[PDB]
């Protein structure tokens, strides 16, 4: 509350494509033996040229859109020159000037208050391969091993303004980001398998600000619960600052996932000179207006408006909708279902309770379980017709979500037709007290569902059936002359 932190992070992203990045090798190469996904091109052999993968672009635009990014009609490819055993070409294909999509913003549920966060650039990169030293991590020995399998897998590197305030807004910024992409179909976003990486920036001075305080940067730190407790730490020590005579200065730190700390530098692959020129091996990428309004209709409805729809556009309450729109598969099976029985009102409840239940008391998603809308359509028109109490129509509902059997079918078998006929409910309910007077006596004084006992009697004695409405009407009156 007293001191104000400004955080901004860099993010890399592995896109879940097929064809790699500038060639025709598979780029989903995790459990793959070393150098089995090599090709003359992505391996930097002499006389090899890069061929822009379409899919790599499709994916970028999707995420650019979701991120509310002013895209870019025109887009150039560039060469980021530098040497390292994990990087073949002697350079890397990125997009310094002309990122396919500039400037945007992602809104966070915000473990704080509901906030917006400004995107800066949003370009594409190639990504080098695994370099492992002779048995060790942040260190050294005698020889390192290169595994190029990963060389040339479509990367997207999103950079974001120093908006973020809380080391939580950070966690949830990337919690949002994964939970977006694990969705539109453009990445697994799962930091663990190095699919979502990130570095970060921090600062502080007064209480009300005039600028910032220049960064610090925290490369290295997988895990989300580890980007928090580590930007957490890079704050507990930034306060013992101008609160002990000290400025907020430069240097860069990574974080030991063992202890719980952070360090300065030792490796020394510094902020050299990367010489960014345009990639003559590739002619510029110009995105068809006449095509692109065709991949804004490709990308799926995000679960926030999929609600806004159902909401004031299907009659469903904020609550009812909000629930239905999680399991996107379920959200589909709602409509798949409404289509065939244009009463959403009831469809909701049923899938929210009875249905969503067996999708749990046995693990599954609607997706494959013998339950077509033709079951509700049937169930329904049948309660509609009064051959079935909303009770019985809940009693039967498992044997149906089990046997596939059509509702109206399993009723023609156990004979569950709502006997609200003759008031022999009048009859059974009398004998009900003859042989149970402690109870009637109880309702003679304790009103609260005391007849609830008799309700149950009539049911037990007629198989589910009776008729809630009618059976109750009767009882609450035969408890008036005792």
């Amino acid at each position: 509350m007293r001191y104000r932190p400004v955080i901004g992070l860099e993010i890399h992203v592995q896109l879940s494509t097929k064809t790699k990045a500038f060639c025709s090798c598979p780029a989903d190469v995790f459990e793959l033996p070393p150098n089995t996904a090599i090709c003359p091109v992505c391996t930097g052999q002499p006389g090899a040229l890069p061929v822009p993968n379409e899919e790599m672009i499709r994916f970028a635009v999707k995420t650019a859109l979701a991120l509310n990014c002013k895209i870019h009609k025109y887009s150039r490819f560039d060469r980021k020159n530098y040497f390292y055993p994990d990087l073949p070409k002697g350079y890397q294909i990125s997009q310094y000037f002309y990122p396919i999509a500039t400037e945007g913003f992602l809104e966070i549920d915000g473990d704080e208050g509901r906030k917006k966060v400004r995107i800066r650039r949003l370009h594409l990169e190639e990504d080098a391969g695994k370099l492992v030293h002779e048995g060790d991590s942040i260190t050294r020995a005698s020889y390192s091993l290169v595994d190029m399998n990963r060389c040339g897998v479509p990367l997207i590197e999103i950079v974001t303004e120093p908006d973020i305030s809380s080391p939580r807004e950070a966690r949830v910024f990337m919690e949002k980001l994964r939970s977006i992409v694990r969705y539109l179909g453009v990445s697994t976003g799962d930091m663990e398998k190095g699919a979502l990486r990130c570095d970060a920036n921090i600062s502080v001075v007064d209480t009300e600000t005039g600028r910032q305080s220049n960064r610090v940067e925290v490369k290295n730190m997988n895990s989300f619960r580890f980007v928090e407790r580590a930007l957490e730490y890079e704050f507990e020590r930034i306060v013992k600052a101008m609160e002990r005579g000290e400025d907020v200065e430069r240097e860069t730190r990574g974080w030991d996932m063992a202890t719980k700390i952070t360090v300065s530098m030792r490796g020394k692959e510094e902020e050299s000179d990367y010489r960014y020129f345009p990639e003559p091996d590739i002619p510029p990428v110009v995105l068809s207006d006449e095509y692109l309004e065709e991949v804004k209709k490709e990308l799926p409805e995000l679960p926030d408006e999929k609600a806004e729809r159902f909401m004031r556009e299907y009659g469903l309450p904020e609550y009812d909708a909000k629930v239905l729109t999680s399991s996107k598969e379920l959200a589909e099976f709602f409509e798949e279902c409404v289509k065939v029985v244009n009463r959403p009102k009831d469809l909701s409840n049923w899938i929210m309770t009875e249905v969503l239940r067996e999708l749990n008391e046995r693990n599954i998603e609607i997706t494959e379980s013998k339950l077509t809308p033709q079951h509700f359509a049937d169930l329904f028109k049948l309660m509609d017709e009064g051959k079935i109490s909303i009770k019985i129509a809940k009693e039967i509902f498992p044997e149906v979500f089990e046997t596939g059997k059509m509702p109206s079918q399993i009723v023609e078998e156990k004979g569950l037709t709502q006997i609200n006929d003759e008031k022999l409910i009048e009859e059974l309910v009398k004998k009900a007290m003859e042989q149970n007077p402690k109870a009637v006596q109880d309702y003679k004084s304790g009103k609260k569902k005391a007849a609830g006992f008799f309700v149950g009697y009539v049911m037990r004695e007629t198989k589910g059936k009776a008729n809630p409405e009618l059976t109750n009407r009767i009882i609450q009156k035969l408890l008036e002359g005792e």
Binding site: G44, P46, G47, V51, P88, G90, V146, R275, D281, I282
Partner: protein
């Protein structure tokens, strides 16, 4: 007929029995001729030819900076010899896929970088007629084992006129299609923007015939997108009614006397077929080479960044990595290359980018734009391919020299611009020919103006300028 000389088209048809000896008696004549001229770095073992394809039997040779599965590609540079190909450059794929049988990998400058051939770190390559002189260009060894007659035709990269130069200076026909017509995939590229694999042949009918085989878009080079281009059909059709164009500082240096002389013939020996050899003055073209020597060795200091002892080729067994890279890239590249990869990294450095580089990258749209619409009042431009006879085995140790010995070649690159070099001389007793620039991406037309000269010119008997008789 002596095979030492034999257009592809004479090869066209000579009996199923008679013509199957053409491969063998091509390596056979190599064992003899070669040791003197020294133009081949590989030369096949003894593999043989079958059938399939209009143009079989016909033995070819191709510049050793051009990946050729089956036989070490080496760019004639210590760092990259000893490297077995891993894929047929598409030009070679398309060649073999047609009938052609490649024989050996022809020498060249180190990484196609220079303007003579001696700069090759494997060994110098001597000009067929006059082992004292030099083939010139970058793909010298190519355009010299063709002249000498060890092979029917060759392929060669052209970055600063690297097929034209050595063709005019060595005696034969070198063509440079427009940047966008021949796959650069499989060409160990030195500059990505300018490079282009072209033929090198005896008839200007083959320079035109090779194209219609070694071309088409390729999905392995995203910079070759298609175009409706014909190198034949209008071939034999003298420019009997076309306006032309000529440079200006073309006469403002000091062309070797014997040169512009047997050149000024091209003027009238064309006007004799009836065509305006008028002139126009282009300004900023004045720079070109100064502009091409920013861009090119800039692209080199990254196109070559890849040869690092890391994964293939040469490697100096040094205990540290910071060592290994350097001591390998030093003892490997060496010579000319070295200094190019240097000035280039410097063109792209911290406080020089928009200064030197980007500027040059814009001047190349200056010269590009000017040269261009000049191809939009009338047809072909033109110039002597060479500004010199064909210098002697030893050379003024001065890079600047070579780096100028072009001009006539450079600007065709700074637009792709098609450009042939057809012979029409013998001057100072070293057969230098002329060049015929073309409209950006407008080819066929230059393959008309070519044959035009090649016949309607003194010296050339049978229709094809003579070939150097070789000590054997």
């Amino acid at each position: 007929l002596d095979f030492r000389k034999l257009t592809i088209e004479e090869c066209l048809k000579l009996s199923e029995e008679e013509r199957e000896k053409l491969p063998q008696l091509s390596l056979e004549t190599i064992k003899r001729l070669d040791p003197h001229v020294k133009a081949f770095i590989s030369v096949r073992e003894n593999v043989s030819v079958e059938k399939k394809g209009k143009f079989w039997g016909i033995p070819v040779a191709i510049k050793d900076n051009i990946l050729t599965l089956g036989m070490r590609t080496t760019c004639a540079s210590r760092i990259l010899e000893n490297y077995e190909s891993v894929f047929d450059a598409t030009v070679v794929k398309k060649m073999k896929e047609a009938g052609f049988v490649v024989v050996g990998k022809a020498n060249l400058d180190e990484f196609a970088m220079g303007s003579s051939t001696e700069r090759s770190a494997f060994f110098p390559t001597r000009n067929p007629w006059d082992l004292e002189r030099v083939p010139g260009g970058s793909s010298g060894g190519s355009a010299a084992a063709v002249s000498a007659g060890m092979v029917v035709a060759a392929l060669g990269s052209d970055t600063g006129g690297s097929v034209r130069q050595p063709a005019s200076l060595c005696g034969v026909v070198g063509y440079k299609p427009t940047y966008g017509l021949v796959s650069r995939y499989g060409l160990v590229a030195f500059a990505s923007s300018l490079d282009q694999i072209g033929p090198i042949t005896k008839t200007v009918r083959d320079a035109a015939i090779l194209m219609e085989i070694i071309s088409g878009r390729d999905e392995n080079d995203a910079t070759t997108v298609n175009r409706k281009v014909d190198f034949l059909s209008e071939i034999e059709e003298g420019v009997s009614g076309m306006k032309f164009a000529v440079p200006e500082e073309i006469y403002e240096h000091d062309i070797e006397e014997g040169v512009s002389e047997r050149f000024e013939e091209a003027l009238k020996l064309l006007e004799r077929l009836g065509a305006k050899v008028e002139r126009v003055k282009i300004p900023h073209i004045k720079y070109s080479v100064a502009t091409y020597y920013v861009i090119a060795p800039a692209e080199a200091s990254s196109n070559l960044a890849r040869f690092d002892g890391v994964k293939y080729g040469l490697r100096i067994k040094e205990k540290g990595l910071r060592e290994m890279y350097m001591k390998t890239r030093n003892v490997g590249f060496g010579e000319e290359v070295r200094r190019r990869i240097m000035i280039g990294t410097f063109t792209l450095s911290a406080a020089y980018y928009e200064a030197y580089f980007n500027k040059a990258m814009k001047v190349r749209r200056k010269i590009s734009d000017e040269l261009n619409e000049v191809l939009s009042q009338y047809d072909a431009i033109l110039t002597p391919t060479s500004p010199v006879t064909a210098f002697k085995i030893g050379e003024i140790k001065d890079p600047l020299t070579y780096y100028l010995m072009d001009i006539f070649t450079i600007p065709a690159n700074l637009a792709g611009l098609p450009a042939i070099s057809v012979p029409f001389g013998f001057s100072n007793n070293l057969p230098v020919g002329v060049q015929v620039i073309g409209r950006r991406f407008a080819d066929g037309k230059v393959f008309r103006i070519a044959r035009a000269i090649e016949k309607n010119s003194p010296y050339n008997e049978n229709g094809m300028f003579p070939l150097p008789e070789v000590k054997a």
